[PDB]
Design an enzyme around this catalytic site. Structure first.
Site, PDB file in Angstrom:
ATOM      1  N   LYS A 155       0.748  -1.240   0.041  1.00 15.33           N
ATOM      2  CA  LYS A 155       0.058   0.140  -0.164  1.00 15.33           C
ATOM      3  C   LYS A 155       0.967   1.353  -0.068  1.00 15.33           C
ATOM      4  CE  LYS A 155      -4.764   0.716   0.038  1.00 15.33           C
ATOM      5  NZ  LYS A 155      -5.536  -0.111  -0.759  1.00 15.33           N
TER       6      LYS A 155
ATOM      7  N   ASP B  65      -6.924   3.975  -5.671  1.00 19.64           N
ATOM      8  CA  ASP B  65      -7.591   3.966  -4.440  1.00 19.64           C
ATOM      9  C   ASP B  65      -8.005   5.398  -4.275  1.00 19.64           C
ATOM     10  OD1 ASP B  65      -8.772   3.265  -1.993  1.00 19.64           O
ATOM     11  OD2 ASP B  65      -6.925   2.837  -1.126  1.00 19.64           O
TER      12      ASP B  65
END
Ligand code: NA
Lengths: 466, 467, 467, 466
Positions: A141, A181
């Site tokens: 991430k 995202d």
């Protein structure tokens, strides 16, 4: 087992012993990162979900703890010049948490709340979500505290280019394939791909979410809604003795892309969608929404950006109920698909659904069902399909994008959809078998937790715990 | 000229009160970004307050300072290794590559259980300006691990060092990042890490400093910090005390490690007498000074036998020992105080005694030995304080000379290394004085060191486009 | 010995007339390969004619010369950048990597709208032999862009420089290609490009020269070309004018940039008297010469105020200004002429006056200042002409010394750099004389520079297998 | 032909002339490596087998000699610390023999007998074996004199990581893809993959034999045994006039994975496996082994690591014969499958099998049949399927593992099995066609040598002989 000698803890343990060991592991995680609240909470939640595994062999708790330390975290200054000519400095991150099953995989978030704790929590959980897809993908991430809101397109381009000027050094098609995202959509993926390509002098699948004209994949908009329906369909066959969506009244909450494409695939399987919802209320068709009606609803919500109530001007049979949730509809409901938001289905909602006869719940959104609502469903023996598996269709297709890039061949929409369906089939079986193997039969939530962890844990040991 | 003026929002002169508010805004911004990094926040605060005279001339320097406070790159990594019992251990490794404007990232590695990101950022940020002061082309960085060497076998340290360098090698290099030793990372660890880096890189370069002289190491490295301290004080005495020198000076030295020992040797070379050494047990005192032979005896006790300074009384009939007292308490005249033991070892009361005992100058061998209250006492007394940020930089200066020797594939004689170290301290002492005078804090060498180190980095940062 | 003889079709001695036809066939071949590169064709023609004495001894040198005329590598690339208005601009970037026989490609970068491949090949080809003459291990290259810095903001120059270096970095390096400044590329651009190269390469090396001394730059860089010109002329006067020197010589200097200013400074050091400076507006004249104090004033006017030379009369009571005339028209005795302004600034008519005013030697600070007709006049008068290819090479010589300092990770004192520059010019003047003598053109320093520069490259090319 | 001018020897030659030229080539090889006995013998055998090719054009002999010098050999010190804390130094090797058809490909052997001569012999033959698979793979071989016997799991881990610390520098997914061999199984491949991944910071198919959880392929354990049976099945159809394994009594030697899965596939085709063997002796079942019986034997050999004599405890009808080979068994044998070791079937054994009615021999192991035994079978008209083709199923599937890694897509077991079967079918056809084209009809041993060589030789010339 060739790695047994490496572990200090081993052998079976009682439930109370595992609870104590989990608390010791939590304290160790806290001492290492005392103020990373989100990451600590994520470690605790995943650890509690794996208690049945830890009881069979304590080595799994140690492996879990070993997995909790990222393989690599890169934080970096991102200097960029805004449209006023002023130098701005933002912080960039890429948490490369685990690469046991494949290259680091996970989205990029550009949001002012972004920090290391949040990215570690999302990156850690992404390891096991990506594991569940059955595809060879690790976990990671990244992002930045850069706030795209209020910035011009040129300022976002300037930031994306400077951000990728450093990130390119640490990523690659066989190393780390980031994705979108919050704050990172088509605009940002495109800007970052151009910079990555220019600096690397190469055209590879180092990002997913690309446009289909240059390495992107079909079915990306439909992936999550379709994948949810696939998973619930296969759970009904595997755990409800050959049951299906056919003839089932499907109450859908939400009116976004997930809800819309979930309704289409339900109709494909012979189910009847009866509700859609938004913040203003829910609409209800006693005899269900046709695909043509769903198409009308899509343009109203996506193009006109209108509320669901506008649909009654198009259907004479449609009913609108202001300031109510889809679960309140006064009819029999066989399947509930929360596809709107977190904690949208509470204990009272679950009780209504049980009384109306819902046999299974599929989580299209993130954490839609409250813990109290889950307890009622478990008592009622209503199957709950965990979101980490049921809504994994997006990440599954991101893996299929990597396959297409690695093959330098763009698949037909039918082929992508076929492999997505196969992925959800194998995922549903893995969750069911994992639950059965650890004597929590039918608890798909536990099955998903176990199946994702074990493939990583066993592969970690195969690879020498390095 | 100025080609980066348009990039900065804050610019131009500002009043003292305005600069105080702007610094407070800068501190709050740093807090929000890293709310729990206590050591890093305080380090930013201390350095910022020390640069207020610069910010008053141009607020742009505050914005540059804030920009410099964000590391260019931080790498944190899992370090798996197998201990002698066959059990897998996982530690956290770090490398803070803070700034490379003046040269490759440069700074030591610390292996200690207290290590975390806040501490390494604090040390790495300060290392930028320390390395700047050496005049050499070196950036700033810091790294290490929470690996605890205490209780570990040699083999376990070998295993950890090799696994640690297996990842670290990917981010360092002779022109990129040249790490060095620190707490928990000495000759043993440098050797182990150099072996692994060489094997993986298939190259023999100056990617670490602190190497043994047989394979790329430099002479004068053990003596560098103590010698450099004496050189710096000597040059300040010449320039600010009207041609004064160490000659005839009674030097009270605190501590008994390498810094204190080699500072004592250099004091004797310059015609002074070191009169005290100390450790946690107390201080020892020679009324007529320690000779070089006596210093050698004390070295053997501390370095080989690891004994306390009181053991020296067995060898000298004239030595006196005072338990649980600091060297500043010695009942005699002290002309130069060289605190070389630890932080906050010289407090307000100590400064007052030293003024009464005739102290004219203080040279900081350790880091932050003199408390802020002690500094105020010395400034009122007109006692010069040579800041540790400059005065104890001899070690990193010789690490840069180690890099030069590696880049030249030529080992210098000890005499050549010593001469270049002395020249570095001479130019550094002059830069500190000139900076202090230019910003109307004449004689405030603490401010001069802060200013001189910062400005070279800030100006080079702008030359390079603020990237 | 000769190990590459079998590789060459042309070999052995040839008559002057045979060489003339061979040169024309070589020129025709070059034209067919690049029919519209006028500057490159003419540059090849000029150098080839200057080497005729060499080709007569062995025609293989002509085949080597032709082989050297094809660049090893030319990279042209699109440079996209966004201006301050937010609009996308596309410029063309170049790097001509002409020859690396003696060392890494070396040569400046020019940002000017007239830049194209023909111009850059012409400058890069000459740079091979100019760098050869310095005795340092440097090849030849040239690059730049048609980007026009005029009318651009500092931020726009930064954006272009960063985008330009984002591609250029892929083809350069400390051991491969070390660019430098030129027209349109000064301290601002070198700094911006260095920042971008450092960020992308994650390394701190001497991949550009002309850097600021705070981060890898060298002393004597601004003075190098002017100082080197005077050094070269001083040695020629000693060696070819029987112990003569700059002492007592009235030196007419054209131009008012850094070359002319620092040439004047070094003339004064050697006891000479600079009497003129010149501009596009005219020339100024001091009957009793410019002192260093006076030159300092002119430096401030020209470098800071960037005013015209007429401004000097406001500061000197004796200064005279003559509009729309060149410094060679000054009505006084002239012993030395130093054209440091522009190409073709000294024509046949100018040479005849200078002979009449008593000029004994001409030193070319600028490139091709002396017209072909003017050179003939000086040869008839027995006035020595020092070719610019050698005499103005001081800048590239110091750029090589900057690389050495970077490779050594050690900054030299200004005195050491100055000493090494002077020794280079001494060896260069000797090399030109010896080469001219060996080929029976004694005293023709212009041919000596051509021959000496070419032969070192030609012989090394054969040593390395003609690859 | 664009490379004709490069060769000194060219054009047709008589049989006696070819024998003289071959002998000069052998002597040249001897002078270059006078004490590499195994490599010299391997070069001699293959050269003599290619005599029909050399007679058509002597350039092929010059090409063959040129191929006998490896492109690259890396030998390296391997330091590692054992569990007692003592430094041990072993020798590591990687013979990168030829990359004409693709990246260097071949196993790694950890055994104290390993030296350069053995690896050159195995790697040279691996060139043409990999050629026969039709896949784009070169040839290589490596390993170490490290002795896994008596070593702990951790000591094997320590050696593998240090071994790969140097090896990683010379291999890669497009350069050299090692695999397993004696002393290098799942444990060692896993350990080495972990180290390669950590150092390279990438997840690729740089090794084959990986576990299916991280880049491995189905059918890999079964590939060589299955492929052996497929090949013999096709030869029985093509050269024995439509005959097949059905109703055939199959004597199998060995008890490893090759023998076990060969028996398994024999049963699939209706044959009856009657024997298994090891160094202690052979066992015999008058009515054959069923799959259940093979399953028991697999557990004994693979998990319990016992000798085959243990099987008698589970089958009342099984027999054990100490210190005797399976070829001595007193019954009729229709098919012989030597699957144990080199030189396991000698002249005397071949004589018994002919007397017992053996119609075909399938070589599962490397060089199992002695030259004297091959002569007996040729005189007896017993078909010999050469190991160079018949046991190539393992390397064929390793190529399919590479394809799956390059595609970032895991194939189903069914897809892998079909492609393995198709590869063996084409290989059996290639052996027959090559033998016919060079007028040695029915000499499948010669056909396999010719077919493997010619694809490499012609491709080498296509590429400029570099
Ligand atoms: Na691929």
């Amino acid at each position: 087992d060739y790695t047994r000698s490496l572990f200090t803890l081993s052998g079976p343990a009682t439930a109370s012993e595992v609870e104590k060991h989990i608390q010791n592991a939590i304290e160790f995680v806290k001492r290492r990162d005392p103020d990373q609240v989100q990451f600590i909470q994520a470690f605790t939640e995943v650890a509690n979900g794996l208690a049945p595994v830890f009881q069979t062999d304590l080595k799994y708790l140690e492996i879990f703890l070993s997995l909790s330390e990222p393989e690599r975290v890169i934080t970096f200054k991102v200097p960029w010049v805004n449209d006023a000519g002023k130098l701005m400095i933002n912080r960039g991150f890429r948490v490369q948490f685990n690469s046991t099953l494949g290259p680091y995989k996970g989205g990029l978030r550009f949001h002012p709340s972004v920090n290391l704790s949040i990215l570690k929590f999302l990156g850690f959980e992404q390891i096991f979500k990506n594991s569940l897809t059955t595809l060879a993908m690790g976990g990671g991430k990244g992002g930045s505290d850069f706030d795209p809101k209020g910035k011009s397109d040129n300022e976002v381009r300037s930031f994306c280019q400077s951000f990728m000027t450093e990130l390119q050094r640490h990523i690659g098609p066989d190393t780390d394939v980031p994705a979108g995202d919050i704050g990172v959509g088509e605009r940002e993926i495109g800007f970052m791909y151009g910079q990555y390509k220019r600096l690397s002098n190469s055209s590879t699948g180092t990002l997913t979410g690309k446009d289909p004209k240059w390495g992107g994949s079909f079915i990306r908009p439909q992936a999550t809604g379709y994948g949810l329906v696939f998973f619930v369909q296969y759970i009904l066959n595997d755990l409800h003795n050959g049951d299906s969506f056919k003839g089932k009244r499907v109450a859908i909450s939400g009116s976004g892309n997930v809800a819309q494409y979930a309704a289409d695939k339900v109709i494909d399987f012979g189910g009847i969608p009866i509700t859609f919802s938004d913040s203003s209320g829910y609409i209800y068709e006693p005899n269900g929404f046709t695909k043509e009606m769903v198409t009308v609803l899509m343009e109203l919500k996506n193009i006109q950006r209108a509320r669901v109530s506008e649909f009654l001007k198009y259907s004479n049979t449609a009913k609108f109920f202001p300031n109510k949730k889809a679960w309140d509809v006064d009819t029999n409901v066989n399947v509930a698909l929360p596809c709107a938001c977190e904690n949208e289905l509470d204990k009272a909602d679950a009780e209504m659904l049980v009384k109306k006869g819902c046999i299974i719940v599929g989580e299209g959104a993130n954490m839609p069902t409250t813990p109290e609502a889950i307890s009622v469903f478990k008592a009622a023996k209503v199957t709950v399909c965990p979101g980490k598996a049921a809504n994994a269709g997006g990440v599954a297709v991101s893996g299929l994008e990597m396959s297409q890039n690695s093959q330098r061949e763009k698949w037909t929409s039918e082929k992508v959809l076929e492999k997505l369906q196969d992925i959800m089939k194998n995922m549903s079986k893995a969750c069911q078998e994992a639950a059965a193997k650890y004597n929590v039969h039918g608890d798909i939530i536990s099955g998903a937790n176990i199946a994702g962890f074990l493939k990583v844990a066993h592969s970690y040991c195969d690879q020498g715990c390095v």
